[PDB]
DNA sequence: TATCCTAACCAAAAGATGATTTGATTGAAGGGCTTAAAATAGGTGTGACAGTAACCGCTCGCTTCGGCAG
């Protein structure tokens, strides 16, 4: 059963279609929050604290936002940037909101001997202590990629909802225990 | 006496004994990484493609140019 520690989400990734053409130079000229460094990259990157997130905008009318701790928080930040662009003088719309990725982490509070895991799980676990200190495991159900360390803490990514993170956590937990 | 020993002590070499100063070490932090994922947005150089390109031991047959012929 559960060890009493829940996987806390660390990140959320989401995108929405603004539905109109925008001028990045105009945004950099008007908005009190903007980049335009075309010498490096022709784009504008936002960020707000409530929710704590970073978003990025193009002239093509797409938005990519990331940084929240919950999917609904990410959507709130997305709608905040949509409001900002609407009051920037652009006819922005909050259309086709899609959630792309999230990151979570947890712990088991006992040491992990990676050698046994690689010896019994090499077919899906990649161990290489020379470059990346931890161990890499790719999980199929659901499409999750997992990082495991000796300290017992685990990083989970590749899901679309917190339920997937929890379910993968409890799938791996017996393996971590033994 | 002329000179010395070497107990107990004075002047100097050396031989040693602990406290202090300087050469040397490092503990922790500035720092600046890692793959792992997911994503739109992009610029061009370049590196395949493909083509011509260039450079790099014994015994017979066949032939000629004079010495008499015509």
From Swiss-Prot:
Keyword annotations from UniProtKB, A to Z: Disease variant, DNA-binding, Host-virus interaction, Neurodegeneration, Nucleus, Repeat, Spinocerebellar ataxia, Transcription, Transcription regulation
List of residues binding DNA: 11, 47, 62, 101, 138
Keyword check for Transcription: yes
Subcellular location: Nucleus
GO biological process: DNA-templated transcription initiation; mRNA transcription by RNA polymerase II; positive regulation of transcription initiation by RNA polymerase II; RNA polymerase II preinitiation complex assembly; spermatogenesis; transcription by RNA polymerase II; transcription by RNA polymerase III; transcription initiation at RNA polymerase II promoter
Principal location class: nucleus
GO molecular-function terms, A-Z: aryl hydrocarbon receptor binding; core promoter sequence-specific DNA binding; DNA-binding transcription factor binding; enzyme binding; RNA polymerase I core promoter sequence-specific DNA binding; RNA polymerase II cis-regulatory region sequence-specific DNA binding; RNA polymerase II core promoter sequence-specific DNA binding; RNA polymerase II general transcription initiation factor activity
Renumbered ranges of Sequence repeats: 9-85, 99-176
Signal peptide positions on this chain: none
Function: The TFIID basal transcription factor complex plays a major role in the initiation of RNA polymerase II (Pol II)-dependent transcription. TFIID recognizes and binds promoters with or without a TATA box via its subunit TBP, a TATA-box-binding protein, and promotes assembly of the pre-initiation complex (PIC). The TFIID complex consists of TBP and TBP-associated factors (TAFs), including TAF1, TAF2, TAF3, TAF4, TAF5, TAF6, TAF7, TAF8, TAF9, TAF10, TAF11, TAF12 and TAF13. The TFIID complex structure can be divided into 3 modules TFIID-A, TFIID-B, and TFIID-C.
Disease listed for this protein: Spinocerebellar ataxia 17: Spinocerebellar ataxia is a clinically and genetically heterogeneous group of cerebellar disorders. Patients show progressive incoordination of gait and often poor coordination of hands, speech and eye movements, due to degeneration of the cerebellum with variable involvement of the brainstem and spinal cord. SCA17 is an autosomal dominant cerebellar ataxia (ADCA) characterized by widespread cerebral and cerebellar atrophy, dementia and extrapyramidal signs. The molecular defect in SCA17 is the expansion of a CAG repeat in the coding region of TBP.
Subunit structure: Binds DNA as monomer. Component of the TFIID basal transcription factor complex, composed of TATA-box-binding protein TBP, and a number of TBP-associated factors (TAFs), including TAF1, TAF2, TAF3, TAF4, TAF5, TAF6, TAF7, TAF8, TAF9, TAF10, TAF11, TAF12 and TAF13. Part of a TFIID-containing RNA polymerase II pre-initiation complex that is composed of TBP and at least GTF2A1, GTF2A2, GTF2E1, GTF2E2, GTF2F1, GTF2H2, GTF2H3, GTF2H4, GTF2H5, GTF2B, TCEA1, ERCC2, ERCC3, TAF1, TAF2, TAF3, TAF4, TAF5, TAF6, TAF7, TAF8, TAF9, TAF10, TAF11, TAF12 and TAF13. (Microbial infection) Interacts with HIV-1 Tat.
Family: Belongs to the TBP family.
Stated name of the protein: TATA-box-binding protein
Organism for this UniProt entry: Homo sapiens (Human)
Stretch of the intact protein here: 159 to 334 of 339
């Amino acid at each position: 059963g559960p060890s009493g520690i829940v996987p806390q989400l660390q990140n959320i990734v989401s995108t929405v279609n603004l539905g109109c053409k925008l001028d990045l130079k105009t945004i950099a000229l008007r908005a009190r929050n903007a980049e335009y460094n075309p010498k490096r990259f022709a784009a504008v990157i936002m960020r707000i604290r409530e929710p704590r997130t970073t978003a990025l905008i193009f002239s093509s009318g797409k938005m990519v936002c990331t940084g929240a701790k919950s999917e609904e928080q990410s959507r709130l930040a997305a709608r905040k940037y949509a409001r900002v662009v609407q009051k920037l003088g652009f006819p922005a719309k909050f259309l086709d909101f899609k959630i792309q990725n999230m990151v979570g982490s947890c712990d088991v509070k006992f040491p992990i001997r990676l050698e046994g895991l690689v010896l019994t799980h090499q077919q899906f676990s990649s161990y290489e202590p020379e470059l990346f200190p931890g161990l890499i495991y790719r999980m199929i159900k659901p499409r999750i990629v997992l990082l495991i360390f000796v300290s017992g803490k685990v990083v989970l990514t590749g899901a679309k909802v917190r339920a997937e993170i929890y379910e993968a956590f409890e799938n791996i937990y017996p393996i971590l225990k033994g």
